[PDB]
Amino acid sequence: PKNPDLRIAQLRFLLSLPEHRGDAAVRDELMAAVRDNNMAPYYEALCKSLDWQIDVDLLNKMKKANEDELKRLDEELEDAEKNLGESEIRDAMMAKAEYLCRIGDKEGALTAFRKTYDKTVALGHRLDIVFYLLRIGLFYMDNDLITRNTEKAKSLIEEGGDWDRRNRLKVYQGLYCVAIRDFKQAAELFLDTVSTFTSYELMDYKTFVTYTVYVSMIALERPDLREKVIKGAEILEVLHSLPAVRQYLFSLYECRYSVFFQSLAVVEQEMKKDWLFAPHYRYYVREMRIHAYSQLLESYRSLTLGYMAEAFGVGVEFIDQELSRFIAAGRLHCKIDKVNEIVETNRPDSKNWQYQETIKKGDLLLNRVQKLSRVINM
Amino acid sequence: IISTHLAKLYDNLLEQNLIRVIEPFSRVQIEHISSLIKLSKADVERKLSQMIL
Amino acid sequence: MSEKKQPVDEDNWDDDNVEDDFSNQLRAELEKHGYKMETS
């Protein structure tokens, strides 16, 4: 079954990528691996693991138990077709082909799933099969195969309302939009946090709360923050159990600038250790820095540079080198003075910066259509 | 129930005259808007900072 | 066709821009600030 199957891949992340931390992960990952009939997905994880020399009989008892379920399917296919129900061969392996999806690889999954997709004439089985293809599409990071069955999925929810098949689906598109660096779409798929449920992949609902707040704090501005995440009783009481994230969120809201970096190292360090945020923990906090800089810096014009050390975060030369790479990076709209020791600001009208992205997209699409135009007709 | 809502009404009505007297000019000193609201300068300074934030 | 005579012989770009501005800078800030609370 595929319901605990995300924790498996997250613990594969926990095995592989922390190099020093690879002992208890290969203990509990084996504790789940050489039981529940798992055969295929851990030979190269055994290569990244140690030798584990005598795994032969361990593989033999489980390819034997796998052979038992295979041969009782082979005892089912001929009794099912003698006096037929609703194609009871594909009705048996429409449920045990997910067992073959976990135990076997994606092939015996896929031919049986696209096989049984034509059996049920209503979407009450079809759309769950497509949910299963989505979930393995995450597992093998099938970034092209998810694009198919997302649209093929969404093509079924219009008949009916199917909000346990649409709001549940929005969790999949939200985890894809935070798998990629699409944060404004990730929180927008994470907009509700009401119909979202005590899930299987986030068995803590509060972990989903932490994810939607970590993406929302970038994703929306103060108006949205001073209405949306501050007045929700459904969002306040779940981080009422959180001492850290409640302080980490409110320190930016209550303008508690110096303590914000303290929990910023905590949440960023946890984000470094975390699966699925490990691609972008480096990009996250450098957005958080320039956001926290611009929020304070667009208040004053005559604010000096040696004010931010004691009130905002210590290290005057650290603020120096940190703002120099941001004005020099082309954002953080201000202009710093040095030897009279004051930071100046400016204001750009949306006439140049709004134009810059236009010449970017124009050069991008011109590269696209010129490249295609060189490809076709020799 | 009135004793609950008078503070939240007092914030909105604080800002309602606050946007009223800030209207007619381009620049002014904070000591005059403290004088014309007849209120202090630190709380008015932080409260004005809350508006531009 | 395609012989090309030989003279000698997302997931990837945004965090690479963080490798551009953020290559060898800070990298492990957890203790420099706690070492700056007493100096600053």
Place this chain on the structure above:
Amino acid sequence: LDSALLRPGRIDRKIEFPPPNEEARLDILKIHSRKMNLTRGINLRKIAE
């Protein structure tokens, strides 16, 4: 109905449909609850009771 319709060689099978019990009032709420935009935490069992 008719006794000529109640000739035993006439009708092949007669099937009774009872009103639903507490178990079968729940699943019609389950299938029927699909197209609604819900709120998490409902306890449909109490509603069926």
